[PDB]
């Protein structure tokens, strides 16, 4: 099974406090596993999985050592960006970064990521090649020239090709405590009518993992895409996801109306 590891960073300024809010948040495959928040009483990285509780102190502070560094880096960078855009001091800013890696079925790397986004918009980001950057807007070029100079990308690449991989592998190997499991969909149709011509059919799907699912209504085999109420794949609060899809129907036709269901963790598409 393919895997990923993600760090979701976010600094945030609001006025009247010269000291922003920093928050890192880790994720293995689609599941959180660590977390830091500068605005805590004791700002320290924490386990968020059960399998993570299995680390012991040197790890727990090798990371909090880093978080305090990045905290300083974000404070600094947020101010720099202020200048590149001519924003005066006085409002709410946001800087986010996302970094991680991906590995195929065969445990090997497939892709690295390192990308930033200022104010919600892409700012600068690292290429599939790990050697060169893509700057999004003019101001983003300052940083680019600046960073080509200081060889910042090698470091990144190193973290991505090495310490990311080597470390994920071991997350995987303590990881079965949820990671390598595939919770299959649990699908059934609702109803709820009234009105002539109305019946409103509802194909649900529940308890699956990962969130990738495609429910499809069909008349014989021609995909009933018309007024298909599709809901956004939502989380259950447990490690699984939900979803449904409605289609409107002339009451009493329900026979040859049929939503198929699709998922990695299934034997074959669930016809309903």
């Amino acid at each position: 099974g393919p895997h990923s590891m993600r760090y979701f960073e976010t600094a945030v300024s609001r006025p009247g406090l010269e000291e922003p809010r920093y928050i890192s948040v880790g994720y293995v495959d689609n599941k959180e596993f660590v977390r830091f928040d500068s605005d805590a009483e004791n700002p320290r990285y924490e386990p968020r999985a059960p399998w993570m509780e299995q680390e012991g102190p040197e790890y727990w502070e090798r990371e909090t050592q880093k978080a305090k560094g990045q905290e300083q880096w974000f404070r600094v960078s947020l101010r720099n960006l202020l200048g590149y855009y001519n924003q005066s001091a006085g409002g709410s800013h946001t800087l986010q970064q996302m970094s991680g890696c991906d590995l195929g079925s065969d445990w090997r790397l497939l892709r690295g990521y390192l990308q930033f986004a200022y104010e919600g918009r892409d700012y600068i980001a690292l290429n599939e090649d790990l050697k060169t950057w893509t700057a999004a807007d003019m101001a983003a070029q300052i940083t680019r020239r600046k960073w080509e100079q200081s060889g910042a990308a090698e470091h990144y690449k190193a973290y991505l090709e090495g310490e990311c991989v080597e470390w994920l592998h071991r997350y995987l190997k303590n990881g079965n405590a949820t990671l390598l499991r595939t919770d299959s969909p649990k699908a059934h149709v609702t109803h709820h009518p009234r009105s002539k011509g109305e019946v409103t059919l509802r194909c649900w799907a529940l308890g699956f993992y990962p969130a990738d699912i495609t429910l499809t209504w069909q008349l014989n085999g021609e995909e009933l895409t018309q007024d298909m109420e599709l809901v956004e794949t939502r989380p259950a609060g447990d490690g699984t996801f939900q979803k449904w899809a409605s289609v409107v129907v002339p009451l009493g036709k329900e026979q040859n109306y049929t939503c198929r269901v699709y998922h990695e963790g299934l034997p074959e598409p669930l016809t309903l």
Partner: peptide, 9 residues
């Protein structure tokens, strides 16, 4: 394991 940023923006 976290990454650590070098050069600022």
């Amino acid at each position: 394991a976290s990454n650590e940023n070098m050069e600022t923006m």
